[PDB]
């Protein structure tokens, strides 16, 4: 509940400030965007810092944080750590809308989006285990494990259908800029977990680990819907000729 | 756990009644239903009865109940107060089958009934969370606002694209009338929500907030699918031409 | 948390041994699998062991494990019992992953894949709140009455349009064989819950009743993936032209 280390509040207070800035610079820019297409990718790209304004509310105000024992063999073992979780529960909502965006964007099958939200949704479900598991080490790193194998999956469709039909969609080079964006920045997060204070406790601080997590909030999501929302403003006519 | 309040009790088996007569009535009114648009919109039209009874019997139950104490400033900091959190959690559920069967009565684009349905889980998530907060009244109210703003951009798709799909998919006449019934009857949970107990608590009586929320189920849920499973029986050609 | 039962943990040994081997046969079996349909359907598969996998470690570490007291009524009321509640939370992701596979192979409508996904969901979590209700025996098996409804919605799918749908996409033969195991083998697990000591407690050995949502599991998801994916693999044409 309480909170009493600058470095970590500042780490959540800086986000819901960038997050509210992002939803008035987006709905702005928004403002002349044609109907169909344009304006449904705008909609999506919009609750990206939605959600992320919610999660960081959910840390501040404690409602999504908890202690949690580490169990025998951790760096911290027998020692109770401060386990921000509620970022990986949104996340469960968040990335399935980046997700959204992105597909939209690409117009790819139906089939394929729902294969890949639902891979990611394992993704964020099975990390969550893996921070709240306490029982045994091997518990925690074996649900990190499955967490990285439902990435793979998410990771899968943005190398193969869903580049090609970017290409036939005609948005082949706005897909493969976010595409780099995605992928370096995502495998930033299972980085930042496994050097933090759950995984293997390289880096012991928790305000440290917070703001790594919230510089990659940062450009995986107001950056990258900012670059993501400019391009559809100033390529109408390709994304709604989909 | 205990109940002993008839107005707070009546307020719950009312609507497990109701529901069931829906649900009998429904079932029915499907007995001579078509093939394919027509008899998919009457099933998630029966299960808007279906996730409705569930919700009250978790609130019977007490499984969905549970008390919370209000944060300094609430009108009641420093009490307890009952919260049917079920309620929220379970609009999760059955608003996005609302919106679903109105998306498919309209025929709207498979991407943007997506993105409504991911803005309105958040509408419901980031309510319950304001429900659940205890640590200070401004996140309560914070989380208030953002569920405000994904409840806005729900709204946004009735008043554009998804009239203009109903538009040529024949249906713009019986989706105009539902949709008056949607945005006048979904305004009405966050005037209770605000007026009642967990809010400002004008009105401290549980049972007369839970009374609120019933009667307003009764429209928004089981009036609002008889009037839409009504229509689709007498206008199968329509529909299934779609 | 402890626990001194060889039955009961083998029971959940075995099926992270044998997902783990149905992963690596089916990442095997799609090594030449065209682009398209088929490679869509065997990544949808490939993850119904990896979320089986997750449930049984959540199982195994005791996360998703408890202890619920039985109420009046019921024929160990007054006693704790164990709760695999995991197994209820996890196939509100397995399930769903089934249909999807089943779905994109009979190429149905996007509009009823949704609608049986969300009365799959309602079938899971009513599930769950039927194993977790204990005010009251007459609510846990309101729940379990109202789950069985969901239930038909979806069999409701398996025996018409989606049959219908699998004859116009040329995968009549295959659905027909996959819509028995799905029926017959779906139909254990009510059996198991109400037989079951959290059911009627006919089999009051917790470790038992494990070994037989357990041996369902081999069949309904690992048996039925292969063979699934077996016939994908050896008729791409016919899915592919979809
Ligand atoms: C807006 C937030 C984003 C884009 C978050 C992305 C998170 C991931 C790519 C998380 C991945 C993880 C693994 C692959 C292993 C287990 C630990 C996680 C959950 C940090
Ligand atoms: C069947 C139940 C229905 C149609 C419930 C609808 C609920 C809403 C439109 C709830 C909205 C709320 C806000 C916009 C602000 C925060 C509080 C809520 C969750 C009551
Ligand atoms: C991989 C696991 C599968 C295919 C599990 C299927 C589970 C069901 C068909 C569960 C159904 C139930 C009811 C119809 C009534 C309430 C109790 C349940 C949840 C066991
Ligand atoms: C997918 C990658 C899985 C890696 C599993 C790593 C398991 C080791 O676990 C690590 O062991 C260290 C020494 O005992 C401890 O100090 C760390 O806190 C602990 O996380
Ligand atoms: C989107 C609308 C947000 C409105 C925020 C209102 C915050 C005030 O909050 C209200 O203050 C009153 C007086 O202190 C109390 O009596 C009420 O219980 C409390 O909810
Ligand atoms: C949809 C089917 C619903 C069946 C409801 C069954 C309710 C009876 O419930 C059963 O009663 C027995 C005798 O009292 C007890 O021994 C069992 O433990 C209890 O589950
Ligand atoms: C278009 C489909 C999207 C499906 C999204 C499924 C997962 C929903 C996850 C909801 C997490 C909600 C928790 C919010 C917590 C908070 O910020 O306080
Ligand atoms: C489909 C969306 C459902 C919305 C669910 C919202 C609430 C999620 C609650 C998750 C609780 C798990 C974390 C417990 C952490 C702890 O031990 O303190
Ligand atoms: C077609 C996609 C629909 C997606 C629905 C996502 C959110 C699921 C919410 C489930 C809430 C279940 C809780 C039920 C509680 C109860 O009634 O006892
Ligand atoms: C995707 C669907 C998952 C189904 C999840 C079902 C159970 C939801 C449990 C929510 C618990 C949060 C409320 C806690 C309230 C309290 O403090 O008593
Ligand atoms: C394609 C859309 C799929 C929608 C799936 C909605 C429901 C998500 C359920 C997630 C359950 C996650 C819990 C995992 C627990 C564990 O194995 O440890
Ligand atoms: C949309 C996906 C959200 C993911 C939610 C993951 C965590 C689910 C937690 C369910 C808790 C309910 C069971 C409580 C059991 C008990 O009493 O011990
Ligand atoms: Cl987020
Ligand atoms: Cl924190
Ligand atoms: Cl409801
Ligand atoms: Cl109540
Ligand atoms: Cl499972
Ligand atoms: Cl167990």
């Given at each position: 509940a309480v909170r009493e280390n600058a470095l970590l509040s500042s780490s959540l207070w800086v986000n819901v400030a960038l997050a509210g800035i992002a939803i008035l610079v987006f709905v702005y820019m928004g403002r002349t965007i044609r109907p169909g297409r344009p304006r449904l990718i705008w909609g999506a790209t919009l609750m990206i810092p939605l959600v992320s304004i919610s999660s960081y509310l959910g840390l501040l105000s404690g409602l999504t944080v908890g202690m949690i024992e580490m169990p025998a063999g951790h760096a911290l073992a027998g020692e109770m750590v401060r386990s921000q979780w509620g970022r990986y529960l949104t996340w469960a909502l968040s990335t399935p809308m980046i997700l959204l965006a992105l597909g939209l964007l690409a117009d790819v099958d139906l089939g394929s989006l729902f294969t890949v939200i639902a891979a990611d949704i394992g993704m964020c479900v099975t990390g969550l285990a893996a921070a709240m598991t306490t029982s045994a080490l091997l518990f925690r790193?074996?649900?990190?494990?499955?967490?990285?194998?439902?990435?793979?999956?998410?990771?899968?469709?943005?190398?193969?259908?869903?580049?090609?039909?970017?290409?036939?969609?005609?948005?082949?080079?706005?897909?493969?800029?976010?595409?780099?964006?995605?992928?370096?920045?995502?495998?930033?997060?299972?980085?930042?977990?496994?050097?933090?204070?759950?995984?293997?406790?390289?880096?012991?601080?928790?305000?440290?680990?917070?703001?790594?997590?919230?510089?990659?909030?940062?450009?995986?999501?107001?950056?990258?819907?900012?670059?993501?929302?400019?391009?559809?403003?100033?390529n109408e006519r390709t994304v709604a000729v989909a």
């Open positions: 790193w074996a649900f990190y494990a499955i967490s990285c194998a439902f990435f793979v999956v998410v990771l899968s469709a943005l190398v193969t259908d869903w580049a090609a039909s970017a290409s036939s969609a005609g948005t082949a080079e706005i897909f493969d800029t976010l595409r780099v964006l995605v992928v370096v920045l995502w495998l930033g997060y299972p980085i930042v977990w496994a050097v933090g204070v759950e995984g293997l406790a390289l880096v012991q601080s928790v305000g440290a680990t917070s703001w790594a997590y919230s510089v990659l909030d940062v450009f995986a999501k107001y950056v990258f819907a900012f670059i993501l929302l400019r391009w559809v403003a100033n």
